[PDB]
Homo-oligomer: A and B are copies of this chain.
Amino acid sequence: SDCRTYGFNTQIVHAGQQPDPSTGALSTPIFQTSTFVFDSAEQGAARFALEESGYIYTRLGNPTTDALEKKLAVLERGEAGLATASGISAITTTLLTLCQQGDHIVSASAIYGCTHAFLSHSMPKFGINVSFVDAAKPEEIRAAMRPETKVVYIETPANPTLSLVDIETVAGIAHQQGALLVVDNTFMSPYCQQPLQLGADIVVHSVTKYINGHGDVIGGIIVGKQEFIDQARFVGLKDITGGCMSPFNAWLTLRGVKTLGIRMERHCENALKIARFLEGHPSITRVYYPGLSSHPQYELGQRQMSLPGGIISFEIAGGLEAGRRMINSVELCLLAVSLGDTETLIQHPASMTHSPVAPEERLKAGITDGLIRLSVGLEDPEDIINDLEHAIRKAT
């Protein structure tokens, strides 16, 4: 049949993939090659003119990576996909394909740190200006739009407190003003949120997180209309960033995404249990999790997301020193950056990543001294809870 007709779990397993045509191999072969051989001058010419299907060179395209791209296009309900060397490369390949000197972007302020760095420091040096706004307030997005605005850029849920952005509303605002909406869907995966179905034009992911899910791949993906993806591929990737994905990385990501449905279900079931535990703990001042009814945008979450996600942020009593004590007291949770791994990961930005940053600078970014971010893994939730309880009690 057509893989676009099956249930979502069936698609996760099968979409974009098929047994190898020459051998019947069930696993997608790893086409770890740089180049491809033609049977004749004519076949070569036909492919370079695009009068013929087939491969030429891995930077341009590759059968293993094509399977991943097609799978993710199916899962996001987009026309086409483009795999990249990293999440950052997915974002920059996208924006550098769309924008040129004199153009403007309206971006959420509550975004991934490195994305913020690209937008605030690099883009302007190429003559592309960026206005940062609070995207939880769609009116701020409207107010910042200019005649030269080409793109509105958002993430939801957002760092660090998992605030939300109303995708459908923002899409309508962007489109009314003739701009595209690009959504970073990394935190949710297509299993939990589908920005294209809500009106977004382009979705990007760091597959480094949930899509791969196994903490062993750096990579990104872009999904959108064929006409845009063709430009992102044959100009953005080919000429500008050169950020192609290794066939081995694509194969690992294909392998990891096979279990996306069951992983997300467990991540989110575990996260809800842990979030409820934290919300009841007298040493914890705040818990940020879309699945708690106390979330300021709970109702939007119920409309836009199928599950509340696997990430929790929370604030511990006693600020900086308590956060440090707590994170140094966990025995099961692992101190690391990143998220979406099978192992539970924990970080305390004020004493770790953002130690080098001024306290007032941290606050403006929504990072309080006691803020802890937890990526909930696939362990027994009782074990994670017991580890957190132990560490919190010691710290406070």
Contact = CB atoms under 8 A, between A and B. Distances in A.
Given A24-B54, A127-B126, A6 B244 contact: no
A249 interface: yes
A19 B334 contact: yes
B122 A6 contact: no
A38 interface: yes
A332 interface: yes
Given A242-B88, A342-B258, A38 B24 contact: yes
A386 to B, nearest CB: 9
Contacts of A37: 19, 24-26, 334-336
A216 B262 contact: no
A347 B42 CA distance: 12
Nearest to A118: B239
Contact of A101 (B54, B121, B126, B327): B126
A341 B45 contact: no
Contacts of A336: 26, 35-38
Contacts of A84: 242
Nearest to A38: B335
Interface of A: 1, 6-10, 12-14, 19-27, 29-42, 44-45, 48-49, 54-59, 63, 84-93, 100-101, 114, 117-118, 121-122, 125-128, 208, 212, 214-218, 220, 235, 238-246, 248-249, 251-252, 255, 258-259, 261-263, 265-266, 323-324, 327-328, 331-332, 334-338, 341-343, 345, 347-348, 351-356, 377-380, 382-383
The 5 closest A-B pairs by CB, nearest first: A89-B242, A7-B380, A88-B242, A27-B33, A45-B355
23 contacts: A1-B331, A1-B332, A14-B332, A19-B37, A20-B31, A27-B34, A37-B336, A41-B323, A41-B351, A42-B351, A44-B352, A48-B353, A86-B243, A87-B242, A101-B127, A122-B239, A214-B258, A241-B241, A241-B243, A248-B248, A248-B249, A258-B342, A261-B378
